[PDB]
């Protein structure tokens, strides 16, 4: 999750 969201943002 941490990784995925940082890409999104
Ligand atoms: Co990372
Ligand atoms: Co990064």
């Amino acid at each position: 999750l941490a990784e995925a969201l940082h890409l999104a943002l």
Side-chain angles (χ1 to χ4, degrees):
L1 187 54
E3 287 289 357
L5 182 75
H6 116 278
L7 289 191
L9 293 178

